[PDB]
Enzyme design. Structure first.
Site, mmCIF file in Angstrom:
data_model
loop_
_atom_site.group_PDB
_atom_site.id
_atom_site.type_symbol
_atom_site.label_atom_id
_atom_site.label_comp_id
_atom_site.label_asym_id
_atom_site.label_seq_id
_atom_site.Cartn_x
_atom_site.Cartn_y
_atom_site.Cartn_z
ATOM 1 N N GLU A 1 -3.552 2.399 -7.553
ATOM 2 C CA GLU A 1 -3.698 3.743 -6.880
ATOM 3 C C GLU A 1 -2.834 4.802 -7.586
ATOM 4 O O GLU A 1 -1.853 5.273 -7.011
ATOM 5 C CB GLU A 1 -3.260 3.743 -5.385
ATOM 6 C CG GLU A 1 -3.236 2.448 -4.591
ATOM 7 C CD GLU A 1 -2.567 2.634 -3.176
ATOM 8 O OE1 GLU A 1 -3.100 3.345 -2.317
ATOM 9 O OE2 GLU A 1 -1.463 2.128 -2.911
ATOM 10 N N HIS B 1 0.853 -1.237 0.000
ATOM 11 C CA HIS B 1 0.000 0.000 0.000
ATOM 12 C C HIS B 1 0.880 1.277 0.000
ATOM 13 O O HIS B 1 2.000 1.244 0.552
ATOM 14 C CB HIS B 1 -0.924 -0.025 1.263
ATOM 15 C CG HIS B 1 -2.024 0.997 1.241
ATOM 16 N ND1 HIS B 1 -1.830 2.303 1.624
ATOM 17 C CD2 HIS B 1 -3.326 0.905 0.875
ATOM 18 C CE1 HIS B 1 -2.952 2.976 1.521
ATOM 19 N NE2 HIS B 1 -3.873 2.160 1.033
#
Ligand code: CL
Ligand code: CL
Lengths: 220, 215
Positions: A137, A89
């Site tokens: 992302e 992440h």
């Protein structure tokens, strides 16, 4: 089915003593989306033993049981009843060789990895190691002025094209603000979403999640 | 009192379902030594609710509550009931600026840090930030052919000297195999020990720890 993942991060509303109160707001759904929650590492055992949904970790280590002070081993997660994790992440980025080692072990143990990436070069680099999911992302979908319904379609189409003919599913992890953004993503070849503050910091979390995953189906 | 810390690491014998069985059998300590256990991060909430012993974390992050995927914040530990942590263990080493930020926040919140170091330069560098405990793990005390009772006394005496007159207690975290090693450490100015496999992997953990801390 499609997949929706709700990341609790370390937000005060949904961690510690508030974890149980937050989760009471939701009921298991039978439908076109499978719902998966990602609790904080300190809440993960409680979620595995006594929660009502499927749960994935926020980060996982490749080291086995042994002399590893301060680690969170994959083999320990499996024994608690957890079957997958988010990895790399943007708030928890890792060295490339660490990511490769972890993907290889997960493949051997049938443990699911949701691998986050920020651009098409990263997405291609990791293709040969076969992540179960890619969560995209990119910086071009991040901003108060921008969303999937407004952005160029090529952003998502390029990553779907990279994974065409593999077993890997693509999820969209930035620029998801409404149901229209979710339905446009699926039209472009994605199989679901990864979301966080839009649900967790809402005045009505239940209603905010329902708006994103509503498909307007008829029943008999 | 003196202090004995037993680190569970991620050993099979004291993690998950085995954590509960291990702690059920282990007997509370009385006398000149206080016992503190350090459970794995995945077991830490369950240890806090159990409460049979004093429990410290194995690692802690300086970040507050918020958007920190995959972190273990100090403020979340405090709210669960945990009052201290080990930091910078040889298996979990950190950048120096990260250590400084963590020691400064801990001081403000009254949270206890057991800071691990490997040599006298590291020990002197962190002195001004006032760690509550220093745990010393130097290469010269690590090996199957070495222990405190056979090593040169200067190894420990140099670190005790650095922290003389401060509020910091010095613990020995390598070369501890028998009671003789513990007694010699205390003779050189240390105030306790940090140990792991010698107790955790024992056929009788309670008896193994008692053999180390009898004076
Ligand atoms: Cl082990
Ligand atoms: Cl928050």
């Amino acid at each position: 089915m499609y997949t929706a993942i709700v990341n609790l991060k370390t937000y005060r509303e949904a961690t510690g003593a508030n974890f149980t109160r937050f989760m009471e707001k939701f009921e298991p759904v039978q439908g076109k989306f499978e719902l998966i929650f990602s609790p904080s590492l300190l809440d993960l055992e409680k979620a595995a033993k006594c929660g009502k949904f499927r749960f994935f970790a926020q980060h996982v280590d490749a080291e086995p049981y042994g002399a590893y002070t301060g680690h969170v081993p994959m083999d320990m997660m499996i024994d608690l009843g957890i079957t997958g994790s988010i990895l790399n992440h943007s708030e928890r980025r890792l060295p490339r060789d660490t990511i490769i080692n972890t993907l290889k072990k997960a493949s051997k143990l049938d443990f699911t990895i949701v691998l986050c990436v920020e651009n098409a070069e990263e997405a291609k680099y990791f293709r040969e190691y076969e992540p179960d999911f890619i969560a995209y992302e990119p910086r071009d979908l991040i901003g108060g002025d921008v969303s999937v319904s407004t952005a160029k379609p090529e952003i998502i189409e390029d990553i779907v094209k990279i994974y065409e003919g593999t077993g890997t599913s693509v999820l969209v992890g930035a620029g998801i603000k409404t149901g229209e953004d979710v339905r446009r993503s699926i039209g472009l070849g994605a199989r679901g979403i990864l979301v966080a503050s839009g649900v967790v910091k809402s005045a009505d979390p239940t209603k905010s999640l329902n708006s994103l995953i509503e498909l307007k189906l008829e029943h008999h």
